[PDB]
Design a protein around this ligand. Structure first.
Ligand SMILES: [Ca+2]
Ligand SMILES: [Cu+]
Length: 199
């Protein structure tokens, strides 16, 4: 496992500004993975059965925010929350790292059950490049570039661990910058505003 910086949310702290790289959720290398540390992580404790919405917005021209939500099952001490199983992540699918260790600390079993994901597909044009042709990378349109909402109903009480990033910045836009490079794009950190609607 590897430590991450988490932003925690609750009923009195429903919003945050997170900073992410333009390609952070979908690098153009390898297996087209997100970069754990180029993205930004949130945590929120939720009650079973009541729908939740997370809304992302950005002012950055060309930027398309994105998000993956997992349920962090069996989490015990909250100080064991801000870890990930590695420096890269698949945008969908479940994560399992039994008896996980990081920097040494013992984190316990990391069990992350996939809940939902989405990315802002408004403004990307008539067709995305073929590198993005994975069905479970949920393309969502609300008619507003730079805005995204996801929803889910917590299947279990407890901690929901989510990553915010961005994907496929518009060619030659501010967000695109110098382009994908080696796959991670520019190191520029762009602000995405996050609002969690806790029931
Ligand atoms: Ca949108
Ligand atoms: Cu990393």
């Amino acid at each position: 496992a590897t430590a991450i910086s988490g932003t925690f949310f609750d009923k009195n702290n429903t919003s945050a500004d997170m900073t992410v790289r333009a390609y952070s959720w979908y690098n153009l290398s390898m297996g087209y993975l997100g970069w754990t540390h180029h993205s930004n992580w949130g945590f929120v404790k939720l009650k079973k059965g009541k729908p939740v919405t997370i809304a992302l917005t950005t002012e950055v021209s060309g930027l398309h925010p994105s998000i993956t939500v997992w349920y962090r099952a069996g989490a015990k001490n909250p100080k064991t929350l801000p870890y990930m199983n590695g420096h890269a992540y698949k945008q969908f699918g479940d994560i399992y790292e039994p008896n996980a260790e990081a920097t040494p600390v013992k984190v316990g079993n990391i069990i992350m059950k996939f809940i939902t994901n989405g990315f802002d597909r408004d403004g990307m044009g008539d067709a995305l490049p073929a590198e993005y042709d994975q069905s479970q990378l949920y393309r969502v349109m609300d008619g507003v570039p730079g805005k995204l909402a996801i929803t889910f109903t917590p299947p279990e009480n407890g901690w929901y661990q989510f990553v915010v990033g961005a994907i496929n910045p518009d060619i030659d836009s501010t967000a695109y910058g110098s382009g994908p490079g080696s796959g991670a794009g520019p190191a520029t950190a762009h602000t995405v505003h996050v609002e969690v609607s806790i029931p």
